[PDB]
Amino acid sequence: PEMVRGQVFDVGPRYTNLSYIGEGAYGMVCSAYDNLNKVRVAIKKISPFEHQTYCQRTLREIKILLRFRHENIIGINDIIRAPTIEQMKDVYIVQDLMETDLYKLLKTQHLSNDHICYFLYQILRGLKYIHSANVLHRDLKPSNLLLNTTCDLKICDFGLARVADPDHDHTGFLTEYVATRWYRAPEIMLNSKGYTKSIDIWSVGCILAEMLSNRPIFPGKHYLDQLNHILGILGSPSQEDLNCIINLKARNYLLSLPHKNKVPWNRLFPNADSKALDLLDKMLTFNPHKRIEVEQALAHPYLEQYYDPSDEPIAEAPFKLPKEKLKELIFEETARFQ
Numbered sequence: 001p002e003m004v005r006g007q008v009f010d011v012g013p014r015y016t017n018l019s020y021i022g023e024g025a026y027g028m029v030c031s032a033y034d035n036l037n038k039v040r041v042a043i044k045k046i047s048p049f050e051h052q053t054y055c056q057r058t059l060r061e062i063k064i065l066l067r068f069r070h071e072n073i074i075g076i077n078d079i080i081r082a083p084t085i086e087q088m089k090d091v092y093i094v095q096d097l098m099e100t101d102l103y104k105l106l107k108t109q110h111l112s113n114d115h116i117c118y119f120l121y122q123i124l125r126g127l128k129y130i131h132s133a134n135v136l137h138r139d140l141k142p143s144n145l146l147l148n149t150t151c152d153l154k155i156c157d158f159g160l161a162r163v164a165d166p167d168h169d170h171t172g173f174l175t176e177y178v179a180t181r182w183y184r185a186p187e188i189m190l191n192s193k194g195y196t197k198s199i200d201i202w203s204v205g206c207i208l209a210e211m212l213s214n215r216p217i218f219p220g221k222h223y224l225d226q227l228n229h230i231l232g233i234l235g236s237p238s239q240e241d242l243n244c245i246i247n248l249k250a251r252n253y254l255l256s257l258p259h260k261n262k263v264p265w266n267r268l269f270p271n272a273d274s275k276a277l278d279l280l281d282k283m284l285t286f287n288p289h290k291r292i293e294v295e296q297a298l299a300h301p302y303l304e305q306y307y308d309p310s311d312e313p314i315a316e317a318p319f320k321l322p323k324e325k326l327k328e329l330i331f332e333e334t335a336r337f338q
């Protein structure tokens with residue numbers, strides 16, 4: 001087998017001329033020439049079989065991406081693995097080669113307002129389809145938004161995704177660990193398991209703010225710091241919004257804080273389009289029940305140059321174990337590519 005940066009990368013002979021792109025916790029990413037389609041592709045090596053959590057996330061990613069078909073969601077073109085479960089140690093996911101991701105782009109590039117608008121449109125168009133499938137992405141952030149050289153945007157990494165379950169969303173204070181810290185909605189720390197679609201809208205609002213300034217809006221230094229940053233900008237929640245939190249530990253924590261004033265969005269983002277800031281405010285609303293939903297966000301005036309509900313498709317078929325069963329499930333889910 002071919003080897004890249006000291007790693008077995010067993011993809012031949014369809015895929016040749018490999019180039020290292022980036023790493024993961026149990027996964028290297030390379031580009032490769034697809035000798036059948038005569039184009040360069042991205043290939044992700046995944047080695048999850050030693051750990052049941054890894055197998056969980058791998059199965060979620062594969063199952064969701066194989067069922068979704070949308071212009072703003074990365075597709076799986078091919079899956080490479082050994083012909084038998086016994087010989088299967090790694091799985092390789094082949095995808096369209098994307099030039100960059102929004103994380104890397106924001107490190108060095110200022111976005112025009114036209115780019116911000118277009119990127120946001122595409123994020124929300126993809127999210128409309130995800131949510132229409134009753135799925136929550138649950139880890140939206142700039143590094144999970146891939147971009148090609150013409151700025152087509154595709155959402156990736158569904159390894160943390162779940163089927164929405166709003167009836168079983170409530171939990172206690174300071175227990176929950178959903179999404180990546182900077183993109184985590186305030187209720188995750190207060191009373192929510194992150195099983196409602198509003199969790200993803202919050203993340204999108206954080207991404208929009210980061211597109212406006214190239215810095216994360218709520219850069220909590222650790223898990224407990226995150227709510228400090230959110231409330232330092234949004235200000236103290238209203239009585240009505242506190243009354244919506246029945247859990248006493250969560251409500252009394254908020255009541256224990258000194259009063260904080262809202263920081264106006266236009267003071268934080270003095271160069272931003274006022275329509276963008278109006279939409280930002282609606283996505284970064286403290287109360288998740290008052291928070292804008294994805295179809296309302298698409299219809300917001302900021303996006304009027306792009307909005308077209310007939311061209312914002314929804315999913316046809318919404319979604320309604322020891323590592324050994326999970327390996328067998330991954331083997332079965334990848335069979336169609338043999």
Ligand SMILES: NOC[C@H]1O[C@@H](n2cnc3c(N)ncnc32)[C@H](O)[C@@H]1O
Pocket residue numbers: 021022023024029042074095096097098099100101146
């Ligand atoms: N993904 O995490 C490790 C590295 O792989 C990159 N990547 C993941 N999928 C990719 C894809 N389809 N096309 C191009 N690059 C990709 C990601 O941008 C990061 O730099």
